[PDB]
Design a protein around this nucleic acid. Structure first.
Ligand SMILES: [Ca+2]
Ligand SMILES: [Zn+2]
Lengths: 262, 217, 217
DNA sequence: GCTGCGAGATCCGCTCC
DNA sequence: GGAGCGGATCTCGCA
């Protein structure tokens, strides 16, 4: 946790990994990995709970597409109409069973409305609307629709309706399609939630800013007290701080820190 | 382990179907338009899409007893049993969940304006605000059970290694011949312990004079 | 034990260097011509001539920080820190000592013509007249601290006895786990003192919450 | 119609006092 | 259990 932060930072400086890879490798919190990645000047100059929504039709019926950037999870459900009210119904019914944090979409008649933004404001999940001019996004969106629509005709004859094939497509994609060590995309999502839940136990007691002094040990010589430095994250007797001089993250034991009243 | 149940409720001349879990307590709600079996079939397959059950128990229904329905449920491979449940625990859980959801939905009336939005919002509130045990949501305990069963099923991989190794000793200031092959007993940092056949004695040998070989046929 | 602090004071355009001690409480004041590095080193050497300090604290000052000063201090080989002491205890002690010495010096200025003789007489009178408790003068505490620092004392710490036991922590009547074996420190009546490995903090555990390890048979 | 060799160190396993 | 002791084993460099 606290101890391996500089190791992750220097590894990312060497190789320029991503936040998810750093989290899976060094075990650092996802927030810390995101902070490290975002602060990279080269990176400034793809993640969990990040989804994309696209519109498609088949046999003159309305269907919505929800593609997860990381877990490769696809979800769909029948939609009566493209109006704003029905669109909101589907969007928040999507949150009924999922807990995302980011979402991207294009411009549409039901995307923008006087009540659409205020409704998502209550949910609190950040959403960005823009034009996907990235060639990677263009080629990634194309394959998902073909993959989901190819499985439709493989099970039409003995299913009664199209909404019946709606669940069959999800069964074909999210249940049987497996990579790695026989891991399904839903397995990836469920496992991701496991390590995602851990950081709540730490951030629950960390929601109150504190200033503290730090002391640098050099060959067993305490030297002096230095600070003040903002406490980044807490640990079992270890505290990580930012050095103003060397611009590096340092780890100090709990026996060389005091409390400064606000 | 992975038991599910179905129950319908009537409110304001409308029918709401509820999926209930016994061991964990998952609750799901949906608005059933008509009593035709097509709606029940599509709801069941949507549930199979969004959930991975192993056992389902339910009462009798006008559309449940149909050859096509049994054929479809056997196509999905799930099991189902007929007859009214006689377990008081299941009845108590179902009644408590139904009364709680009814109370929550009737309390939440002024906040919404639409209907489908209202049902899905009630689903959100019931599935999120329900804190059981150490503040665990029903979906949270469900994913806990899934990850626990997955890790207990996959834990056998780390146990089936039984790798083989060679070893050699220093005699009269010079290295000896590569004795083996043999199966390692315990391997830690710096050295590993092995069983010798010449003297039937345990010997600890460092990593600087060993070789690692997969077990033979 | 044997904690010292060095400070400067001004009186009638005269610089006086003062050493304040915590355990013995003795004040040592001398006259310094100027707050230069070489003279500061000379004064520290004069102070070290009859005393053997172990812990020293200093405030901010240009003479305190210097490459030659730090080399000389490492020549001393004594645990000392230099910086800005914001601890209220040290500041309060030093200001109280300064106030006391300022109050006391003006009483014996007239009959003693020499300033050095006057300050020596004042400090002599203070350390021979002022007594606390049952009549404990500061040099008695100082010699007690000095005689507690015998080299032969450290070797007399293990005659025959050494034991081991477990310990469990209690939080509002709810006990914890045994935390593994740990080394004992001393055996009291009704409770014992142990050292934690995770936090390096000394704790006290009741006898009823401690499981004794039997001696080898 | 024929050819490698041993001196000088070092321990094991032994038995005997 | 201490004790020395006979012998198998090792490398290297003559040309
Ligand atoms: Ca020759
Ligand atoms: Zn980077």
């Amino acid at each position: 946790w606290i101890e391996n932060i500089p190791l992750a930072e220097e590894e990312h400086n060497k190789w320029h990994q991503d936040a998810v890879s750093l989290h899976l490798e060094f075990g650092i919190p996802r927030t810390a990995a995101e902070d490290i990645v975002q602060q990279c000047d080269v990176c400034q100059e793809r993640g969990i709970d990040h989804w994309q929504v696209d519109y498609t039709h088949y046999e003159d019926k309305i269907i919505l597409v929800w593609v997860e950037t990381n877990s490769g999870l696809i979800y769909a459900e029948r939609v009566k109409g493209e109006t704003g009210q029905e669109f909101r119904v589907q969007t928040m019914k999507w949150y009924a069973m999922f807990a995302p944090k980011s979402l991207q979409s294009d411009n549409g008649p039901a995307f923008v409305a006087e009540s659409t933004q205020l409704l998502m404001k209550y949910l609190g999940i950040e959403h960005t609307t823009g034009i996907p001019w990235n060639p990677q996004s263009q080629a990634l969106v194309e394959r998902t629709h073909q993959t989901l629509k190819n499985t439709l005709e493989k099970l039409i004859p003995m299913f009664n309706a199209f909404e019946s094939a709606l669940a069959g497509t999800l069964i074909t994609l999210n249940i049987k399609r497996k990579g790695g060590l026989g891991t399904s995309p839903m397995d990836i999502f469920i496992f991701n939630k496991e390590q995602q839940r851990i950081q709540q136990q730490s951030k629950s007691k960390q929601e109150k800013i504190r200033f503290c002094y730090y002391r640098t040990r050099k060959r067993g010589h305490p030297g002096e007290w230095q600070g003040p430095t903002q406490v980044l994250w807490g640990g079992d007797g270890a505290i990580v701080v930012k050095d103003r001089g060397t611009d590096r993250y340092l780890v100090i034991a709990n026996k060389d820190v005091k409390f400064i009243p606000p």
